Amino acid sequence: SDEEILEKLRSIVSVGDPKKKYTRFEKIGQGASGTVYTAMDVATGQEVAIKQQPKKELIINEILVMRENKNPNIVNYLDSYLVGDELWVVMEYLAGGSLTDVVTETCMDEGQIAAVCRECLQALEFLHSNQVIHRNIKSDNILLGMDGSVKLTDFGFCAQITPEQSKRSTMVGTPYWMAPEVVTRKAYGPKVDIWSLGIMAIEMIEGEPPYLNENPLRALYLIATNGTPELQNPEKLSAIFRDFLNRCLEMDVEKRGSAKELLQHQFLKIAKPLSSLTPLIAAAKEAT
Numbered sequence: 448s449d450e451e452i453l454e455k456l457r458s459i460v461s462v463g464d465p466k467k468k469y470t471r472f473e474k475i476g477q478g479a480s481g482t483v484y485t486a487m488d489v490a491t492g493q494e495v496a497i498k499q500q501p502k503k504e505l506i507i508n509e510i511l512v513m514r515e516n517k518n519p520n521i522v523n524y525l526d527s528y529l530v531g532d533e534l535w536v537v538m539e540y541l542a543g544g545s546l547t548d549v550v551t552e553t554c555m556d557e558g559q560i561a562a563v564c565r566e567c568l569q570a571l572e573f574l575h576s577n578q579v580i581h582r583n584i585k586s587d588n589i590l591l592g593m594d595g596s597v598k599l600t601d602f603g604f605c606a607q608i609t610p611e612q613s614k615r616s617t618m619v620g621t622p623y624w625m626a627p628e629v630v631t632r633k634a635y636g637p638k639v640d641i642w643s644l645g646i647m648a649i650e651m652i653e654g655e656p657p658y659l660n661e662n663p664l665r666a667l668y669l670i671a672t673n674g675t676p677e678l679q680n681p682e683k684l685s686a687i688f689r690d691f692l693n694r695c696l697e698m699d700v701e702k703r704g705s706a707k708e709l710l711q712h713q714f715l716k717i718a719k720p721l722s723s724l725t726p727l728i729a730a731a732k733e734a735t
């Protein structure tokens with residue numbers, strides 16, 4: 448019965464030698480599982496990012512889900528290899544870095560924040576319409592292009608739902624960003640991603656998710672009891688922004704906005720061009 452799951456992901460990986468297609472191999476990061484490098488396509492002259500035991504079932508889920516859900520607001524999966532003993536997942540390279548650096552080292556005005564939310568909601572609307580829940584939306588899993596491109600990544604925790612089983616009840620995600628209905632093991636749908644988006648907006652405002660100074664469990668408890676979080680300074684924000692936040696962070700899932708609904712919110716109408724994010728990127732790179 449197992450681990451014939453290991454032979455399953457051997458079917459997925461492509462045929463050939465990795466070294467023969469991508470030169471200019473250079474490392475640019477590492478984070479628990481696993482580590483990230485860089486390279487160029489000898490064929491097309493394209494720069495690419497290469498990620499490099501436990502529970503490899505996730506890495507399968509990540510490959511498959513990424514392959515069948517191409518979107519301009521998703522970090523594009525390319526090829527896969529395994530000629531060694533670690534995964535050779537190749538994806539498009541965004542040099543601007545993660546949104547985390549930006550939210551914790553810079554100040555974003557509402558026009559910048561709206562632009563980010565709109566790009567993310569676009570990815571969410573696409574994924575949800577394909578019955579996929581990301582379940583781990585956070586600034587850490589938002590990568591930025593040097594041109595201000597905003598793309599979604601990390602799909603190991605994705606949940607493929609079906610008309611027969613459109614809900615889950617497993618506590619997956621990262622505590623500070625997890626919807627109350629996920630924390631309290633209740634039946635939940637795609638709008639949990641919308642909750643995590645809201646939390647990420649709080650990131651973009653206050654620098655970090657609510658209860659971050661608390662321990663993960665304490666945070667988990669607080670989310671389960673407090674429900675919808677409070678801004679430290681709600682009055683700093685426009686009325687239309689506060690509204691968008693309220694409809695992202697609604698306790699009533701039915702009263703909470705869908706991606707498609709939220710893409711029509713008046714708040715996104717004050718979104719700046721994506722080029723406006725490049726100064727935020729340069730700022731984050733500095734002080735680092």
Ligand SMILES: NC1CCN(c2nc(Nc3cc(C4CC4)[nH]n3)c3sccc3n2)CC1
Pocket residue numbers: 475476478483496497498522538539540541542543544545587588590600
């Ligand atoms: N949470 C992680 C997310 C990945 N990350 C990351 N990714 C970057 N660009 C990438 C990565 C990918 C492949 C991995 C999907 N394409 N483009 C860059 S550029 C400067 C820093 C940096 N950090 C480090 C934190």
